[PDB]
Design an enzyme around this catalytic site. Sequence first.
Site, PDB file in Angstrom:
ATOM      1  N   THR A 180     153.930  48.676 -30.843  1.00  0.00           N
ATOM      2  CA  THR A 180     154.827  49.265 -31.835  1.00  0.00           C
ATOM      3  C   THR A 180     155.782  50.265 -31.195  1.00  0.00           C
ATOM      4  OG1 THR A 180     153.330  48.942 -33.709  1.00  0.00           O
ATOM      5  CG2 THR A 180     154.863  50.792 -33.857  1.00  0.00           C
ATOM      6  N   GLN A 191     152.385  39.385 -33.630  1.00  0.00           N
ATOM      7  CA  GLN A 191     151.241  40.033 -34.255  1.00  0.00           C
ATOM      8  C   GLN A 191     151.538  40.340 -35.721  1.00  0.00           C
ATOM      9  OE1 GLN A 191     149.805  44.161 -33.708  1.00  0.00           O
ATOM     10  NE2 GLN A 191     147.934  43.208 -32.876  1.00  0.00           N
ATOM     11  N   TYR A 210     143.451  48.964 -39.305  1.00  0.00           N
ATOM     12  CA  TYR A 210     144.443  48.478 -40.262  1.00  0.00           C
ATOM     13  C   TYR A 210     143.748  47.546 -41.257  1.00  0.00           C
ATOM     14  CZ  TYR A 210     147.750  50.803 -37.198  1.00  0.00           C
ATOM     15  OH  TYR A 210     148.409  51.740 -36.446  1.00  0.00           O
ATOM     16  N   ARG A 218     143.236  39.753 -32.888  1.00  0.00           N
ATOM     17  CA  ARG A 218     142.908  40.930 -32.100  1.00  0.00           C
ATOM     18  C   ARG A 218     141.846  41.762 -32.788  1.00  0.00           C
ATOM     19  NH1 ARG A 218     146.494  45.694 -28.951  1.00  0.00           N
ATOM     20  NH2 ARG A 218     145.522  45.072 -26.966  1.00  0.00           N
ATOM     21  N   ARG A 261     151.189  50.193 -22.094  1.00  0.00           N
ATOM     22  CA  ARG A 261     151.945  51.390 -21.741  1.00  0.00           C
ATOM     23  C   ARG A 261     152.795  51.206 -20.485  1.00  0.00           C
ATOM     24  NH1 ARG A 261     147.109  55.595 -22.518  1.00  0.00           N
ATOM     25  NH2 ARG A 261     145.986  53.637 -22.071  1.00  0.00           N
TER      26      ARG A 261
HETATM   27  C1  LIG Z   1     153.091  53.113 -28.262  1.00  0.00           C
HETATM   28  C2  LIG Z   1     151.996  52.125 -28.532  1.00  0.00           C
HETATM   29  C3  LIG Z   1     152.131  51.192 -29.555  1.00  0.00           C
HETATM   30  C4  LIG Z   1     151.113  50.270 -29.797  1.00  0.00           C
HETATM   31  N1  LIG Z   1     151.250  49.344 -30.814  1.00  0.00           N
HETATM   32  C5  LIG Z   1     150.255  48.419 -31.049  1.00  0.00           C
HETATM   33  C6  LIG Z   1     150.394  47.451 -32.044  1.00  0.00           C
HETATM   34  O1  LIG Z   1     151.421  47.360 -32.738  1.00  0.00           O
HETATM   35  N2  LIG Z   1     149.373  46.554 -32.252  1.00  0.00           N
HETATM   36  C7  LIG Z   1     148.228  46.599 -31.491  1.00  0.00           C
HETATM   37  O2  LIG Z   1     147.334  45.785 -31.696  1.00  0.00           O
HETATM   38  N3  LIG Z   1     148.083  47.547 -30.502  1.00  0.00           N
HETATM   39  C8  LIG Z   1     149.097  48.448 -30.273  1.00  0.00           C
HETATM   40  N4  LIG Z   1     148.938  49.379 -29.270  1.00  0.00           N
HETATM   41  C9  LIG Z   1     147.710  49.339 -28.406  1.00  0.00           C
HETATM   42  C10 LIG Z   1     148.129  48.535 -27.144  1.00  0.00           C
HETATM   43  O3  LIG Z   1     148.461  47.169 -27.402  1.00  0.00           O
HETATM   44  C11 LIG Z   1     147.070  48.548 -26.042  1.00  0.00           C
HETATM   45  O4  LIG Z   1     145.892  47.887 -26.470  1.00  0.00           O
HETATM   46  C12 LIG Z   1     146.728  49.959 -25.558  1.00  0.00           C
HETATM   47  O5  LIG Z   1     147.904  50.729 -25.347  1.00  0.00           O
HETATM   48  C13 LIG Z   1     145.877  49.907 -24.287  1.00  0.00           C
HETATM   49  O6  LIG Z   1     146.553  49.185 -23.268  1.00  0.00           O
HETATM   50  P1  LIG Z   1     147.294  49.963 -22.065  1.00  0.00           P
HETATM   51  O7  LIG Z   1     146.293  50.901 -21.421  1.00  0.00           O
HETATM   52  O8  LIG Z   1     147.784  48.909 -21.096  1.00  0.00           O
HETATM   53  O9  LIG Z   1     148.440  50.752 -22.669  1.00  0.00           O
HETATM   54  C14 LIG Z   1     149.955  50.283 -29.020  1.00  0.00           C
HETATM   55  C15 LIG Z   1     149.818  51.225 -28.010  1.00  0.00           C
HETATM   56  C16 LIG Z   1     150.830  52.140 -27.764  1.00  0.00           C
HETATM   57  C17 LIG Z   1     150.634  53.130 -26.657  1.00  0.00           C
HETATM   58  C1  LIG Z   2     150.663  51.921 -32.863  1.00  0.00           C
HETATM   59  C2  LIG Z   2     149.409  51.384 -32.790  1.00  0.00           C
HETATM   60  C3  LIG Z   2     148.443  51.991 -31.825  1.00  0.00           C
HETATM   61  O1  LIG Z   2     147.223  51.409 -31.555  1.00  0.00           O
HETATM   62  C4  LIG Z   2     149.028  50.220 -33.652  1.00  0.00           C
HETATM   63  O2  LIG Z   2     148.007  49.597 -33.408  1.00  0.00           O
HETATM   64  O3  LIG Z   2     149.958  49.619 -34.465  1.00  0.00           O
HETATM   65  C5  LIG Z   2     149.608  48.441 -35.095  1.00  0.00           C
END
Ligand SMILES: Cc1cc2nc3c(=O)[nH]c(=O)nc-3n(C[C@H](O)[C@H](O)[C@H](O)COP(=O)(O)O)c2cc1C
Ligand SMILES: C=C(CO)C(=O)OC
Lengths: 404, 404
Positions: free
Chosen positions: B34, B110, B192, B239, B346
Amino acid sequence: SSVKISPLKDSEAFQSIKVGNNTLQTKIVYPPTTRFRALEDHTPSDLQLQYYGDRSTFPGTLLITEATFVSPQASGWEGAAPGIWTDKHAKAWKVITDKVHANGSFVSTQLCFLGRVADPAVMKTRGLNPVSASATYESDAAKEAAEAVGNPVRALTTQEVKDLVYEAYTNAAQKAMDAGFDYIELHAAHGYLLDQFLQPCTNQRTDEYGGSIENRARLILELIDHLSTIVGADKIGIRISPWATFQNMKAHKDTVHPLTTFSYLVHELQQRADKGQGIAYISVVEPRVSGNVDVSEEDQAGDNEFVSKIWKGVILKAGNYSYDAPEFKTLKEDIADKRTLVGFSRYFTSNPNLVWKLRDGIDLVPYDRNTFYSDNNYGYNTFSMDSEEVDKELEIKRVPSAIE
Amino acid sequence: SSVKISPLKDSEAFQSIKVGNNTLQTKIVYPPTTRFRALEDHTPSDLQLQYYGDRSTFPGTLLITEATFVSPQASGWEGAAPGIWTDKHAKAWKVITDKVHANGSFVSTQLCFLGRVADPAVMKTRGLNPVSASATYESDAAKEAAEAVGNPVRALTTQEVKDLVYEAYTNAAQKAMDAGFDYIELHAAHGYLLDQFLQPCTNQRTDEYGGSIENRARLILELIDHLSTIVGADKIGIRISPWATFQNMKAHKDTVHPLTTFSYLVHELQQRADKGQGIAYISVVEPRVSGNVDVSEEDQAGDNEFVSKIWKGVILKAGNYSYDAPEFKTLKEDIADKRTLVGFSRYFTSNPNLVWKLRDGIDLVPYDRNTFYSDNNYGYNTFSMDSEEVDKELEIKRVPSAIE
Ligand SMILES: Cc1cc2nc3c(=O)[nH]c(=O)nc-3n(C[C@H](O)[C@H](O)[C@H](O)COP(=O)(O)O)c2cc1C
Ligand SMILES: C=C(CO)C(=O)OC
Ligand SMILES: Cc1cc2nc3c(=O)[nH]c(=O)nc-3n(C[C@H](O)[C@H](O)[C@H](O)COP(=O)(O)O)c2cc1C
Ligand SMILES: C=C(CO)C(=O)OC
Ligand code: NA
Ligand code: NA
Ligand code: NA
Ligand code: NA
Ligand code: NA
Ligand code: NA
């Protein structure tokens, strides 16, 4: 010597391009390259499976197979080249196209037919004659060789020419689809059968397939048209070598100049494209090379600019593109129009990862002409191994075997 | 700080893998992330087109879109997230999926639905209530906020739950196909809506959709089954985040432990696979991360080994995989079974070419949490530019606009 090269990563060579119904991710192509590592009965071998697989690893590369015989009559080399006329051929090729596809890459098969240059002794074993548009030979020596074994070249009859369209190439196209090929490419270059039809030094027919520029092109356009109705124009390519004098084509010394012959053909292909039957690509050999031989700037009598001016679709160019390495000025000019692919044959033999090397400016490993046409794995798949693990004597003894 | 990394080129991360009906050429995935750069009406923007395009350049990469709302009732963030319920949404997304596809890559959307965490003031503007499996809030503060604007969370009726399956997610799936998405992924993680149904802290229903492990899973499996009949199981992902306590999920402190809840779900998914209805992948969040937050080794209460033991198909794992950089011991262990993908969220925000960087051991650019959720291009597409050409003040002023 190893060739220093500048990276092509940021160039047009790594911009995607739609070719027929597939999109390539690199414009660097492996052109058809005869190597004689098929099985005796022309079924593709275990060695070929690895060989094409090793060259498919940059996802979205187009590989074009070595000349592949459309029928027994199409053959005639002493070396073991592959075919695509039996279910056995198709099933074996399918293992290879499957492997290329699993890497996200694509493969075209070059459909060939030797014609007047078929070895008369080899053809005699099939109970076949060497055949051509007309009863001619590439040399007096060839004529003497054929007559000495009582197996002269003979001109195909009108019905036999029709048989090429409706039987030989039709079946080959069907088998190619069974084999999972993304394209079929008509070999109309280098003095083989289709080139023999196109040009007047080799075609003195007095039926509908000779006696004028239009009549000489007729078989080739008939193949394009008929095969388009079977597999779709998007799955068809064609290779031409307007300037080549390989296998005694007269080229610029012929009674009709290549600019005339080949502009006629290419313009007819473009007119089909205007009507929604545009073939996938035209492959052209640059005047730097004639067959498997380099041509001096002195001996070059024309260029392929006409193809670019006349045809609006995808063009594949090949022929000593590393001549101005490291900076690749000519390659970059040639791909600037965004619809042009560039092929490397000889350097792809010694650099299975050539797309990767060109991408990042890695020194090219020199190729080994001595093993271009030998019958075994040495100088074939050995370029994918670290030397310290290449047992040379074992590899020389490794002849092609059945896949799996 | 920039992260030193060893090259992953020769690892399992660059071996091809079939996921549903597509083959990826890298196992490195961009997970749903997101960013709030959609348009106000939830149509995808010009900025998003470039953003996903920039991350698709290693051919055969899977990108998974940020959480995308299935319907107006599914929304509820103050930031501008995208949707997939109108023709306008689908047409805009199609420009984006087209761009990813032209690079030989693939994209999953998603599908999300906020549920009990939807902002009550935002929902009030739609004439909607925040909704959930049961009338609960993530905190006392949220409860006070909702009641203060006379818009409390309410439990969906049985018919409304059916409406999710046959209307909201059905239409979203249809629009996703119109938009050219290769997969649809059910967001059943992070507290969610779907996670709210699965787990008992959030679901105290007394109809068929609550009151037992099986009943709580019912909606999710009904979505899997129904959507499989529309788009095919090969186009479906899901997921889950078994260990996460994001948005006040109790996880290991709940009355049913995540191992129970999620093993039940995954085993039901495998039984469908045994019957020829195997979904494309299960995406799981590693216990190193909870939502958008890292979790100390101290606070980690379980792991996702159970998913590997129970499910036989493709698994996507994500969550601080660079924690043991440069050598990536954990990543390498996790992909050793040859059916596992590894996600980086990230680091993909600040490294649009992350697949290429990981391939060849290029230092990772640190990410900027401050601009994760802001409304403009600064810290969004600016990571694709050379700094000397990034006009920061202009980019901060660059809000999302219509595609083309
Ligand atoms: C800014 C941000 C937005 C995210 N948005 C979503 C999202 O929309 N849906 C989701 O399932 N996870 C979301 N996540 C979780 C990430 O997909 C991911 O699982 C998490 O950041 C761990 O992975 P990483 O260490 O490579 O960042 C988000 C994470 C961050 C930091
Ligand atoms: C912005 C996040 C962080 O886990 C999210 O999961 O959005 C669906
Ligand atoms: C060993 C060898 C085999 C070849 N086989 C074929 C062939 O089967 N069909 C064809 O059209 N050209 C064939 N060629 C010509 C090449 O495809 C290519 O046009 C030529 O080698 C020039 O390209 P290069 O300078 O990159 O090698 C062959 C060339 C060589 C050296
Ligand atoms: C081996 C060559 C060299 O041009 C050939 O064209 O085979 C079809
Ligand atoms: Na490969
Ligand atoms: Na690959
Ligand atoms: Na050009
Ligand atoms: Na690209
Ligand atoms: Na590309
Ligand atoms: Na694993």
